[PDB]
Design a protein around this motif. Structure first.
Motif, PDB file in Angstrom:
ATOM      1  N   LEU A  97       2.540  20.573  82.606  1.00  0.00           N
ATOM      2  CA  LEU A  97       2.232  22.030  83.235  1.00  0.00           C
ATOM      3  C   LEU A  97       1.734  22.763  82.142  1.00  0.00           C
ATOM      4  CD1 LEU A  97       4.985  22.183  85.927  1.00  0.00           C
ATOM      5  CD2 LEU A  97       2.434  21.715  86.014  1.00  0.00           C
ATOM      6  N   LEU A  98       2.685  23.127  81.049  1.00  0.00           N
ATOM      7  CA  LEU A  98       1.968  23.985  79.904  1.00  0.00           C
ATOM      8  C   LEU A  98       0.771  23.535  79.365  1.00  0.00           C
ATOM      9  CD1 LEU A  98       5.307  24.647  77.986  1.00  0.00           C
ATOM     10  CD2 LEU A  98       4.187  25.966  80.030  1.00  0.00           C
ATOM     11  N   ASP A  99       0.896  22.129  79.178  1.00  0.00           N
ATOM     12  CA  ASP A  99      -0.478  21.464  78.597  1.00  0.00           C
ATOM     13  C   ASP A  99      -1.882  21.855  79.162  1.00  0.00           C
ATOM     14  OD1 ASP A  99       0.807  20.941  76.218  1.00  0.00           O
ATOM     15  OD2 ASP A  99       0.854  18.810  76.682  1.00  0.00           O
ATOM     16  N   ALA A 100      -1.543  21.935  80.579  1.00  0.00           N
ATOM     17  CA  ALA A 100      -2.574  22.154  81.592  1.00  0.00           C
ATOM     18  C   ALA A 100      -3.335  23.395  81.327  1.00  0.00           C
ATOM     19  CB  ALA A 100      -2.240  21.914  82.977  1.00  0.00           C
ATOM     20  N   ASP A 101      -2.515  24.427  80.596  1.00  0.00           N
ATOM     21  CA  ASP A 101      -3.173  25.599  79.924  1.00  0.00           C
ATOM     22  C   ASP A 101      -3.469  26.655  81.052  1.00  0.00           C
ATOM     23  OD1 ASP A 101      -3.427  25.238  76.996  1.00  0.00           O
ATOM     24  OD2 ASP A 101      -4.858  23.737  77.736  1.00  0.00           O
ATOM     25  N   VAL A 102      -2.816  26.669  82.079  1.00  0.00           N
ATOM     26  CA  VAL A 102      -3.570  27.695  83.480  1.00  0.00           C
ATOM     27  C   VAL A 102      -2.184  28.300  84.373  1.00  0.00           C
ATOM     28  CG1 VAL A 102      -5.836  27.049  83.641  1.00  0.00           C
ATOM     29  CG2 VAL A 102      -4.559  25.639  84.759  1.00  0.00           C
ATOM     30  N   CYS A 103      -0.842  27.796  84.042  1.00  0.00           N
ATOM     31  CA  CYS A 103       0.123  28.164  84.675  1.00  0.00           C
ATOM     32  C   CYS A 103       0.615  29.543  84.306  1.00  0.00           C
ATOM     33  CB  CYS A 103       1.530  27.613  84.161  1.00  0.00           C
ATOM     34  SG  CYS A 103       1.790  25.920  84.743  1.00  0.00           S
ATOM     35  N   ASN A 104       0.995  30.363  85.137  1.00  0.00           N
ATOM     36  CA  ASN A 104       1.229  31.856  85.057  1.00  0.00           C
ATOM     37  C   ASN A 104       2.737  31.443  84.765  1.00  0.00           C
ATOM     38  OD1 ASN A 104       2.148  34.611  84.957  1.00  0.00           O
ATOM     39  ND2 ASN A 104       1.731  34.793  87.268  1.00  0.00           N
ATOM     40  N   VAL A 105       3.110  31.493  83.616  1.00  0.00           N
ATOM     41  CA  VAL A 105       4.671  31.216  83.144  1.00  0.00           C
ATOM     42  C   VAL A 105       5.326  32.553  83.424  1.00  0.00           C
ATOM     43  CG1 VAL A 105       5.854  30.502  81.207  1.00  0.00           C
ATOM     44  CG2 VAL A 105       3.599  29.967  81.461  1.00  0.00           C
ATOM     45  N   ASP A 106       4.820  33.633  83.756  1.00  0.00           N
ATOM     46  CA  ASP A 106       5.559  34.970  84.182  1.00  0.00           C
ATOM     47  C   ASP A 106       5.791  35.291  85.364  1.00  0.00           C
ATOM     48  OD1 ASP A 106       5.813  35.433  81.267  1.00  0.00           O
ATOM     49  OD2 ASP A 106       4.173  36.646  81.257  1.00  0.00           O
ATOM     50  N   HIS A 107       5.580  34.328  86.302  1.00  0.00           N
ATOM     51  CA  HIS A 107       5.667  34.341  87.880  1.00  0.00           C
ATOM     52  C   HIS A 107       7.184  34.527  88.220  1.00  0.00           C
ATOM     53  CE1 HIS A 107       5.701  33.373  92.188  1.00  0.00           C
ATOM     54  NE2 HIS A 107       4.803  34.455  92.076  1.00  0.00           N
ATOM     55  N   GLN A 108       7.563  35.722  88.912  1.00  0.00           N
ATOM     56  CA  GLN A 108       9.008  35.570  89.260  1.00  0.00           C
ATOM     57  C   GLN A 108       9.242  35.249  90.609  1.00  0.00           C
ATOM     58  OE1 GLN A 108      11.062  39.472  88.627  1.00  0.00           O
ATOM     59  NE2 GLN A 108      10.471  39.596  86.229  1.00  0.00           N
ATOM     60  N   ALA A 111      14.056  35.365  93.994  1.00  0.00           N
ATOM     61  CA  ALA A 111      15.359  35.657  93.552  1.00  0.00           C
ATOM     62  C   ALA A 111      15.134  36.925  92.162  1.00  0.00           C
ATOM     63  CB  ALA A 111      16.187  34.627  93.150  1.00  0.00           C
ATOM     64  N   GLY A 112      13.910  36.629  91.645  1.00  0.00           N
ATOM     65  CA  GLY A 112      13.691  37.466  90.605  1.00  0.00           C
ATOM     66  C   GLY A 112      13.262  36.936  89.195  1.00  0.00           C
ATOM     67  N   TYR A 113      13.665  35.466  89.255  1.00  0.00           N
ATOM     68  CA  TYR A 113      13.537  34.822  87.765  1.00  0.00           C
ATOM     69  C   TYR A 113      12.231  34.110  87.486  1.00  0.00           C
ATOM     70  CZ  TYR A 113      18.477  35.935  88.504  1.00  0.00           C
ATOM     71  OH  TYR A 113      19.555  36.619  88.677  1.00  0.00           O
ATOM     72  N   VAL A 142       9.053  36.467  76.733  1.00  0.00           N
ATOM     73  CA  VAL A 142      10.752  35.984  76.878  1.00  0.00           C
ATOM     74  C   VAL A 142      11.378  37.600  77.157  1.00  0.00           C
ATOM     75  CG1 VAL A 142      10.228  34.185  75.312  1.00  0.00           C
ATOM     76  CG2 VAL A 142      10.716  36.550  74.312  1.00  0.00           C
ATOM     77  N   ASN A 143      10.843  38.400  77.196  1.00  0.00           N
ATOM     78  CA  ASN A 143      11.260  39.829  77.235  1.00  0.00           C
ATOM     79  C   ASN A 143      11.265  40.509  78.645  1.00  0.00           C
ATOM     80  OD1 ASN A 143      12.120  40.215  74.683  1.00  0.00           O
ATOM     81  ND2 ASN A 143      10.323  40.547  74.020  1.00  0.00           N
ATOM     82  N   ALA A 144      10.867  39.619  79.813  1.00  0.00           N
ATOM     83  CA  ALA A 144      10.348  40.185  81.018  1.00  0.00           C
ATOM     84  C   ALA A 144      11.967  40.174  81.537  1.00  0.00           C
ATOM     85  CB  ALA A 144       9.946  39.235  81.941  1.00  0.00           C
ATOM     86  N   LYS A 145      12.151  41.287  82.374  1.00  0.00           N
ATOM     87  CA  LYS A 145      13.310  41.721  83.219  1.00  0.00           C
ATOM     88  C   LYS A 145      13.293  41.228  84.645  1.00  0.00           C
ATOM     89  CE  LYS A 145      14.898  45.955  82.002  1.00  0.00           C
ATOM     90  NZ  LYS A 145      15.121  47.457  81.501  1.00  0.00           N
ATOM     91  N   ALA A 146      14.389  40.297  84.893  1.00  0.00           N
ATOM     92  CA  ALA A 146      14.545  39.936  86.155  1.00  0.00           C
ATOM     93  C   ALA A 146      14.510  41.092  87.488  1.00  0.00           C
ATOM     94  CB  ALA A 146      15.803  39.154  86.487  1.00  0.00           C
ATOM     95  N   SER A 147      13.867  40.856  88.498  1.00  0.00           N
ATOM     96  CA  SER A 147      14.014  41.988  89.269  1.00  0.00           C
ATOM     97  C   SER A 147      15.251  42.348  90.017  1.00  0.00           C
ATOM     98  CB  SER A 147      12.885  41.620  90.574  1.00  0.00           C
ATOM     99  OG  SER A 147      13.694  40.660  91.364  1.00  0.00           O
ATOM    100  N   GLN A 148      16.378  41.594  89.832  1.00  0.00           N
ATOM    101  CA  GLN A 148      17.750  41.645  89.989  1.00  0.00           C
ATOM    102  C   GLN A 148      18.335  42.036  88.822  1.00  0.00           C
TER     103      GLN A 148
END
Length: 240
Positions: A97-108, A111-113, A142-148
């Protein structure tokens, strides 16, 4: 001589219908079938890495916009294949998935994670797994905050006593001083729960502010003292 995994004609014609209507927002049966197959292939416990990589190539072949669209689909829980892959510890699929280079890794998810937060709690066996986790960390915030409760991945690793994930996150730039919704830090969490080695690693971080106060006025030191973890109190004093 490999038996390559092929899109069914149903799947490929769905990918093309998507390609055709992708830049036309006004333009559900299609999408529903696509999503169901995609999650059946990518996101189950028993998912086959080869299959997922063959499908990713085949989507890109239809078009890069189709590939991007599909692999960022989320279900009714707001989970993507990345979320499921991480939570299932299928780190080969995480890597694909990472090597496919187009994932939004930051999607919560709902539950907020983010996937980075779920990784901070996922069962890791080998060093190969941990190499993929660090790659994951490096592909997202890596510094994103969970919505919860506004928890970070680092706080989550600390609260679960995951020393390896704390080390991994700190090595991938995580900010030790971020405060959650209560104004609490990782270092405060570690101090409350009596996690000595984790306190030591957090304190070793350049810039670690042991003086910070939560919304109530509590410091890591005051929390360790009230908790009766005087060994931690001594460590904090030597730092402060």
């Amino acid at each position: 001589f490999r038996e390559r995994y092929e899109l069914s004609e149903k799947m490929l014609s769905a990918c093309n219908l998507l390609k055709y209507n992708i830049k036309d927002p006004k333009a559900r049966i299609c999408l529903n079938t696509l999503q169901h197959d995609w999650f059946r292939v990518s996101s189950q416990k028993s998912a086959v890495p080869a299959m997922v990589g063959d499908y990713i190539a085949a989507f890109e072949a239809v078009s890069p916009d189709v590939l991007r669209y599909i692999i960022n689909m989320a279900d009714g829980n707001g989970n993507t294949a990345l979320h499921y892959s991480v939570s299932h510890s299928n780190f080969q699929i995480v890597k694909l998935l990472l090597d496919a280079d187009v994932c939004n890794v930051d999607h919560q998810n709902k539950a907020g994670y983010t996937p980075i937060m779920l990784a901070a709690l996922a069962a890791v066996e080998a060093e190969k797994d941990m190499q993929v986790v660090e790659e994951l960390f490096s592909c997202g915030d890596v510094n994103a905050k969970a919505s919860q409760a506004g928890q970070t991945a680092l706080m989550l690793a600390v609260s679960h006593g995951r020393i390896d994930m704390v080390k991994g996150l700190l090595a991938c730039g995580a900010d030790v001083n971020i405060q959650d919704d209560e104004g609490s830090t990782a270092l405060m969490c570690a101090s409350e729960h009596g996690h000595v080695e984790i306190v030591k690693l957090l304190l070793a971080q350049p810039g670690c502010n042991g003086h910070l106060e939560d919304n109530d006025g509590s410091t890591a030191l005051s929390i360790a003292l009230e908790a009766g973890h005087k060994d931690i109190a001594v460590l904090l004093y030597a730092h402060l």
